[PDB]
Amino acid sequence: PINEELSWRINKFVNQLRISYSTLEEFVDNFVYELKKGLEAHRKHPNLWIPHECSFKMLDSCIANIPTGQEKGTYYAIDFGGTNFRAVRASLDGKGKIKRDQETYSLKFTGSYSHEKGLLDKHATASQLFDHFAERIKYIMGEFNDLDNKEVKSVGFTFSFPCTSPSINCSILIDWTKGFETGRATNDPVEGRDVCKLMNDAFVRAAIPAKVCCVLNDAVGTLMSCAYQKGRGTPPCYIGIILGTGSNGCYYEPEWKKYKYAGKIINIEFGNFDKDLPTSPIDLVMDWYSANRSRQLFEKMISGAYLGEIVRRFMVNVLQSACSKKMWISDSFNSESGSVVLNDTSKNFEDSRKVAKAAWDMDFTDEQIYVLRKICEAVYNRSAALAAGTIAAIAKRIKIIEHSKFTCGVDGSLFVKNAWYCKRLQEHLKVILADKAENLIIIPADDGSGKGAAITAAVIALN
Ligand SMILES: OC[C@H]1O[C@H](O)[C@H](O)[C@@H](O)[C@@H]1O
């Protein structure tokens, strides 16, 4: 039970974050419309993204051979998913089974102090990033005695960024997202260059006996892994969703041949959606402070690289002068801390006080811990609601041609590391799909980004 001047603030600011069922429907409609415009735009100029024609990049994956579940072998993969970089080793057993061995390192915290924060810096060169990839592949390879010999090892590469892929072995970086600016201020950029080559050169510098044989977006990797692990009689995987540091999805487009595609699976790049976004003033501020102003706008509303900060800025606006100096500090509250508050089962809300004291140095009153709950609910629900609409809209585009039972695989910290979020996304998704809700099967695909690169390396072997 709370002061009235506070509650008026609570009611006002949560209302900027509400999403009614009618508007969410318009979203699904606007999304589906934007999808066809992307397909038609791709038919006209398949090699070029003309953004005024469509916010979606609708990029060809060059994948036409879906996994059969029988792909066999052991392959290395490198999973470049964003702020963290993860190197993997995976063996395939010939049935839908995967053993996986993984080592997650960080790009922000390289161990240097130049370049402000990270290998993301405009002043970091391209060569450093790809060398660091080879450096960690070297270490994982030496550990397994696979490295020392002189016969070349093939490697799958998931590059979680919008790329133009003229082939499965060719991928040109279009635009950095998720806060990266690597090479933009140097003579050695990543943007506009073949990432397959840049990596193969990183192998060459370190004498590593490896070669990248495929480059794929992390969303498509999730789909590939699901298809491989697809049980007999279990419907096929036609959608891959990543809901994590960034937010994006791939899907199976039946008209792939018609609209001049080489693969069947399209990387939508829906993070860059810009039509009728239900923005709040904090959303304008977040975009303004970004390194990619006016791009990835939808992602800046719903992605996990951004939820904690949205909560914080809303938090400051509601409690007003009761906030500690650290409450005003940018990026004091990450999205993981929001997961704790939403998924708190302690009695005295003990766990929720800890994240508040840990981030802000405030022994939260019972009043203020109530506020942190509601502000976390209002923000996170907006992400889940729009995310469900996104899935449904993708489902509607497929079902327009192909209506049946099929499954959609979901990956990323926001979905597998947050029970509350996973509940809301599925709840909203059940509402939008209406009667057909039973037709879409949501299945978690943990580490689909990393497995899928390896499975793709296998399918190349199979031809
Ligand atoms: O990390 C998941 C998503 O985040 C960003 O939007 C990337 O541009 C996109 O390629 C990726 O699929």
Author numbering: 24 to 486
Direct quotes from the study:
PfHK is the first and simultaneously rate-limiting enzyme of glycolysis, catalyzing the phosphorylation of glucose to glucose-6-phosphate (G6P). As already discussed by Srivastava and colleagues, the tetrameric assembly of Plasmodium hexokinases is unique since most hexokinases occur in a biologically relevant manner as monomers or (pseudo-)dimers.
In this study, we present the first PfHK structure in a closed-state conformation complexed with glucose. The crystals belonged to space group P3121 and contained two monomers within the asymmetric unit. The citrate interacts with conserved residues from both domains: G104, N107, R109, T268, and S436, which are typically involved in ADP/ATP binding. In monomer B, P-insert residues L130-G141 adopt a completely different conformation compared to monomer A, pointing into the active site channel and resulting in a large shift of up to 20 Å for residues G134-E139. The P-insert is rearranged in our structure upon citrate binding and probably also upon ATP binding. The loss of this contact alters the AB interface and affects the neighboring molecule in the tetramer. This could be an allosteric effect, possibly explaining the binding of citrate (or physiologically ATP) only to one subunit.
